[PDB]
């Protein structure tokens, strides 16, 4: 924002913002898979109880 | 539609474009950030000068 012009730089930060959301998306996807696996084990634990 | 006309120094034509600083583009008149429209610039040496 500070070094160069405001008009040209916006797509630049858009590049940045896209990557961050992309990274966030990747992270949350992994969590779902792990949760599902844990859930299966949890159900098995219930059967063991 | 709005037409805003004046006469400016021939060297500093590019200061009309948004985001350019200085004195003729800061202390006199400046465009907004999200400006829509365009400017026409041409020489006046036979008539005005």
Curated annotation (Swiss-Prot), chain A:
Name under which the protein is recorded: Spike protein S2'
Domain of life: Viruses
Impact after mutating residue 2 to A: In strain: Alpha/B.1.1.7
Gene name per UniProt: S
Function: Subunit of the fusion protein that is processed upon entry into the host cell. Mediates fusion of the virion and cellular membranes by functioning as a class I viral fusion protein. Contains a viral fusion peptide that is unmasked after S2 cleavage. This cleavage can occur at the cell membrane by host TMPRSS2 or during endocytosis by host CSTL. In either case, this triggers an extensive and irreversible conformational change that leads to fusion of the viral envelope with the cellular cytoplasmic membrane, releasing viral genomic RNA into the host cell cytoplasm.
